[PDB]
């Protein structure tokens, strides 16, 4: 008789329909008789469509479902640092309770157009190619897009590890992965010491579809607490395509009309809601910021698919990783031609900006004239120099796994490459030259490194030149 309880009519495929519940809110959280919880999405004339947030095999037709009176929310606080939790905020690492004393709703409005500020601070990822050619700023959202087995997870892990000395909190969200893979990632983070400022949110492939659907919102809700209390947050979503697929499954099970590739109508609205909450707040709202790195997995390099098109149109930039480039020895595999950043320059320090243009020009000249490698093997006045410089640029941009590089050393190595000090060195010796130069720098050019760190500008040209020739005298060409 009351409007706070209901009876289940239909059960199947992880969704249920209930009679009654006349006063339930859209998006509200409900509880079944056996203790599993659910979220109400569809409110029809006579019944309520409920998605189940747990094992639904224990639910039968005719049992009771009750109101809770609260829109779905997740716990927030500093106690979540270093823990692994599910999108409901429950710990899965087995280290006990979390002990947070505050909650935040899953769905919250994005900051207004007048509460924001222009992006002007660099987000140092430790990857030379990204830091030089595709800059990322604090408050920006950058898409990492590519096929399977191309290195996106490795790029994300290196970026998270590089934030050790900075003042940012990292959040890693894993949607639809193996629990073994998630545990391996957590072990790598613990080994490298990044687990004292990182929060991990897990929604494995065996979990119900609504958990995969809700995980990124739980991540952004956790990040927004630190953002609005004045801190800087980095959030990574491991597969928005899997999140979209879970949402499509829920929508089709609820019998909503399908669209292209059987996706619902509001699939673009879903990702817009998710990604619009990353912002750089104005000084009136505090200096806090949140930056996002969504991931999209393409099929056979087709970026014209529906979900990739939506995410590309939403984000501020793209980073493309290619399988052929990956297997040709370029392990970072970043296609510097297709990749673009719309916050370039503003997201770089002055020293990096003073060399990035020349590096971009040198790489652009070498990416064309690739057909001329075999032809005109004889001496030529111009194209030979361009090819020789481009080969060394490609060799310089390579980098090993889990080896982030400080920006003060990236600037120096790019300066050495662009100013022509690498011309008399064979291509095979370039990486050894770079490693030995890094070892030489922290031994002798400490004054140059400190000048770069303190002033964010290039050191004195003559002193830098003297250091470079002094190292070149010691270096042994093989």
């Amino acid at each position: 008789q009351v409007s706070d309880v209901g009876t289940v009519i239909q059960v199947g495929d992880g969704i249920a329909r209930a009679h009654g519940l006349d006063n339930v809110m859209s998006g509200e959280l409900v509880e079944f008789a056996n203790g599993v919880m659910g979220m109400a999405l569809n409110l029809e004339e006579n019944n309520v469509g409920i998605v189940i947030l747990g094992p639904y095999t224990g639910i039968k037709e005719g049992d009771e479902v009750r109101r809770t009176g609260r829109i779905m929310e997740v716990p927030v606080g500093e106690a979540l640092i270093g823990r692994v939790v599910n999108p409901l905020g429950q710990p899965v690492d087995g280290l006990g309770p979390v002990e947070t004393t505050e909650t935040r709703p899953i769905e919250s409005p994005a900051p207004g157009v007048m509460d924001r500020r222009s992006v002007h601070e660099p987000l140092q990822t430790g990857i030379k190619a990204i830091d030089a050619l595709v800059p990322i700023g604090r408050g920006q959202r950058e898409l990492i897009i590519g096929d399977r087995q191309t290195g996106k997870t490795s790029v994300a892990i290196d970026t998270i590890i590089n934030q050790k000395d900075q003042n940012m909190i990292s959040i890693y969200v894993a949607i639809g992965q193996k629990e073994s893979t998630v545990r391996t990632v957590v072990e790598t983070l613990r080994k490298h010491g990044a687990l004292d400022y990182t929060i991990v949110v897990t929604a494995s492939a065996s979990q119900p579809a609504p958990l995969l659907f809700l995980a990124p919102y739980a991540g952004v809700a956790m990040g927004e607490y630190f953002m609005y209390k004045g801190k800087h947050v980095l959030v990574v979503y491991d597969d928005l395509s899997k999140q979209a697929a879970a949402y499509r499954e829920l929508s089709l099970l609820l019998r909503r009309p399908p669209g292209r590739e059987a996706y619902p109508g509001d699939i673009f609205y879903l990702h817009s809601r998710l990604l619009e909450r990353a912002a750089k707040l104005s000084d009136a709202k505090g200096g806090g910021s949140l930056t996002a790195l969504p991931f999209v997995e393409t099929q056979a390099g087709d970026i014209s698919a529906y979900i990739p098109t939506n995410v590309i149109s939403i984000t501020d930039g793209q980073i493309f990783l290619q399988s052929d480039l990956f297997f040709s020895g370029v392990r970072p595999a970043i296609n510097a031609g297709l990749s673009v950043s719309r916050v370039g320059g503003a997201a770089q320090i002055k020293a990096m900006k003073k060399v990035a243009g020349t590096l971009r020009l040198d790489l652009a000249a070498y990416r064309e004239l690739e057909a001329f490698a075999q032809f005109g093997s004889d001496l030529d006045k111009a194209t030979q120099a361009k090819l020789a410089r481009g080969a060394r640029t490609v060799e310089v941009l390579k980098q090993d796994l889990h080896q982030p590089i400080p920006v003060e050393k990236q600037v120096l190595i790019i300066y050495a490459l662009t100013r022509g000090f690498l011309d008399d060195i064979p291509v095979e010796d370039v990486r050894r030259f770079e490693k030995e130069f890094y070892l030489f720098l922290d031994q002798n050019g400490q004054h140059l490194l400190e000048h770069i760190r303190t002033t964010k500008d290039l050191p004195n040209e003559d002193d830098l030149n003297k250091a470079i020739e002094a190292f070149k005298k010691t270096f042994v060409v093989s």
């Binding site: 859209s26 029809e44 924001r116 669209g259």
Partner: protein
Amino acid sequence: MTRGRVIQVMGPVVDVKFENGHLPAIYNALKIQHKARNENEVDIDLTLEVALHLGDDTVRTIAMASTDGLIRGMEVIDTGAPISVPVGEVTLGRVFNVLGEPIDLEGDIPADARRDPIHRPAPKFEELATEVEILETGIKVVDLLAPYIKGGKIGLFGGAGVGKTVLIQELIHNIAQEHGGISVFAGVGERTREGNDLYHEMKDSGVISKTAMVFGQMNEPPGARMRVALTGLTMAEYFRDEQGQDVLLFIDNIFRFTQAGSEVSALLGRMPSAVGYQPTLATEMGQLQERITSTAKGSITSIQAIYVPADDYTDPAPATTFSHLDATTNLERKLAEMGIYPAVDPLASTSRALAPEIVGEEHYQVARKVQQTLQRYKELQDIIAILGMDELSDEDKLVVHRARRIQFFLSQNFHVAEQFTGQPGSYVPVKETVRGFKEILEGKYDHLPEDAFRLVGRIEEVVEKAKAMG
């Protein structure tokens, strides 16, 4: 007795049941204001737009914001009219959403102000103009190789880093200065960061005081992203009809408008047409575009930025969009790198107005000769790169010599760039630019250094600059 009642909620779609005989008309706006009665409810401030009459006193609506927190049975009131937004000088220098509420922090518009319906029929056949008239923008390349038409639609192609916003600001400044007409900007599917940056750019340039800015943000529901262009159009139409001015209307991206319409159709459940687009794609595009026309007392000129899906120009959305365009402007990254700040491609840009019937025989001949010279210079690039400059024939030498002058003279110093350069801007009449290009083609200035033509206005400023150099 005018009250409704929420009966069914499915995401962004809401169904409302009304008393028999008191249904609201199509496209009417419904408002929901709810105060939390207890701890198990939340406050609601939502606006709906009527879409279909389902029968049995039920109406299907599209929500303009998030529907979270709605409860079956709360009261819905009917406003008795479509969405209404303020018009007049109160809109100048302000930023609005689709509902017509100010977004900046400069307070709210009083209720005593006049408001106009968003949905209205296009102007009738006998209210339209009979003669085609050229809109003088004061930009040399646009006025010469791609003239604009009062009441026409201009497609704008390009991307980031090519100065699209700078060109938009210069167009606003020039039109307001030399014609007295205001401009309106409609940010359909606008990224919030870019909207904030553009607002600050306009405030710094000073053209903010003569423009009305409307944003339908990318995180808004498909209904709002669909309807924002119409409220921008209404704000422009007020000045077109009441003040008799010539008004500019800027649409941030029209493909986003079409895709929002497609999403709304999919949510409503209509059977898809074309590849995946709505059945009413052409109807919606026509209803939007046909209100941007010249009348007996004024005109609206619209510049659309157009995105082409998968680079396929035969895709249904670009195909429908191109059926209304009268001109086309392309921005070239190579020219931007070379140093031509207007960055308009002189050969890829096309216009329907470039015909001797309306622009003049001398203008047509000068434009054709300039394009021919530029094409001839373009054809020689590979041979010049391979063999060198000295290997060419005498006529090729002359062609290159004159074309490198023309390419530089196509540039211009903008008023909005003064804050960065220190050089004041210029407004070049069409007669002046035509005469200057004719003089350059005739060889009158072959002895002058080429850098003298870089960032000057009329044909005398190049002489003065060259004399200053020596």
